[PDB]
Ligand binder design. Structure first.
Ligand SMILES: Cc1cc2nc3c(=O)[nH]c(=O)nc-3n(C[C@H](O)[C@H](O)[C@H](O)COP(=O)(O)O)c2cc1C
Ligand SMILES: Cc1cc2nc3c(=O)[nH]c(=O)nc-3n(C[C@H](O)[C@H](O)[C@H](O)COP(=O)(O)O)c2cc1C
Ligand SMILES: O=C1c2ccccc2C(=O)c2cc(S(=O)(=O)O)ccc21
Ligand SMILES: O=C1c2ccccc2C(=O)c2cc(S(=O)(=O)O)ccc21
Lengths: 200, 200
């Protein structure tokens, strides 16, 4: 199986989602020694904003593209192909200003591709990624899951993942991390117990 | 009064939100000839992803910053100061992949600043932007306001704007734009009637 491990935190060694996403992957490798892991750090190697230039490049034949358009088209193709090849995806998803990092949304914009990860039908849109397993690693300073404040974060992610057809989704959450050291530690400990005894 | 006009569509002349945001501003200038308009096209002049480097630069004294850190700090300061100075903000907000463009979120990340547009208190967080009037120009190919699919779009924006204390918010919406020419035209016409007879 191919597992794509994505991180999007900008907090480096202080990141809760980087710690828990690595822990999920390590547990996964221990459960399935044959898994092949591909890593993509969307904060360290940020994907360009999906732009007018991205669209023009996609509509320009390869042999006619200039260097900037070749970069956009290759970025689009490599990101999409890596996701299409993955059978499982572990996604580190901080909440920054009430939604996911732009580094993560910029990746979503390269993997939401008509004819590839969903299709338009005469009957409506349909997701094409039903075979892929996703583990979302959801981290936030506050506790706002299931409340309106959470809309841009987990609720959005569930919308997007549902649209491209993900049915097998697990959420490893550590929230309330900004409320103090004890609260942060317990939320991480609870997430670790989930990883240890509820994921595999 | 200072009006900040922000666009974030990547669709140029084909953009619904650029057309309606300009229409809001033109109507506003006609209602109040003394208004002073500042324009910021977040797609044409994109703001860098809010990154680890953005945070390091903010924590580095000016006289110690290298060129990249000076760029991050100036980007942060100019964007925040332009928003602090604005008394009214008109924001073009497409829905791309179930949320706002990363170009718009990258601006949100530069204007959500503790001590400036909200503060942490011993009693909790409090918005500081209650005097500012906002008109959100909300455009989408589908019709999903008030439904879960809409979470990352208007619901998120309302969360963010509420957090920084905006109380005077109007939403000019044109949705269902992808359902065909007639449906697109009526949705734009309805938005124009709102601008003409319900905003000023
Ligand atoms: C720029 C920035 C914005 C943040 N905005 C929010 C927010 O809107 N709501 C919230 O609950 N926590 C917010 N937080 C706290 C983060 O969600 C918390 O630190 C979480 O651990 C981030 O995941 P990470 O440690 O993997 O980076 C923010 C943190 C940063 C650095
Ligand atoms: C890259 C891209 C992604 C889009 N994703 C969505 C979407 O998730 N949901 C939707 O209803 N419309 C979607 N649309 C349609 C836009 O919301 C619609 O075209 C709207 O007019 C965009 O505002 P604009 O014309 O000002 O750019 C998308 C359009 C583009 C170009
Ligand atoms: O901006 C925030 C932030 C920035 C940097 C570190 C931590 C936070 C944070 O915990 C937070 C919580 C919340 S709340 O909605 O849980 O009150 C809102 C905003 C932030
Ligand atoms: O990706 C979409 C897109 C991309 C480019 C142009 C238009 C659309 C669109 O209308 C849309 C609608 C919807 S729906 O949720 O209203 O069915 C979902 C996705 C898209």
């Amino acid at each position: 199986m191919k597992l794509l491990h994505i991180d999007s935190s900008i907090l480096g060694d202080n990141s809760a989602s980087r710690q828990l996403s690595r822990e999920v992957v390590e547990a996964w490798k221990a459960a399935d020694p044959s898994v092949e892991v591909v890593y993509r750090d969307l904060a360290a190697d940020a994907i360009a904003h999906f732009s007018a230039a991205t669209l023009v490049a996609a509509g320009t034949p390869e042999d006619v593209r200039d260097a900037a358009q070749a970069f956009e088209a290759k970025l689009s193709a490599e990101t999409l192909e890596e996701f299409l090849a993955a059978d499982a995806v572990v996604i580190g998803a901080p909440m920054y200003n009430f939604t996911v990092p732009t580094q993560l949304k910029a990746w979503i914009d390269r993997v939401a591709v008509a004819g590839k990860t969903f299709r338009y039908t005469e009957a409506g849109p349909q997701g094409l990624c039903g075979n892929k397993k996703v583990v979302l690693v959801s981290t936030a300073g506050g506790l706002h899951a299931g409340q309106p404040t959470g809309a841009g974060h987990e609720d959005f992610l569930k919308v997007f993942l549902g649209f491209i057809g993900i049915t097998d989704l697990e959420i490893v959450r550590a929230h309330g991390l900004a409320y103090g050291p004890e609260q942060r530690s317990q939320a991480i400990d609870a997430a670790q117990a989930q990883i240890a005894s509820e994921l595999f």
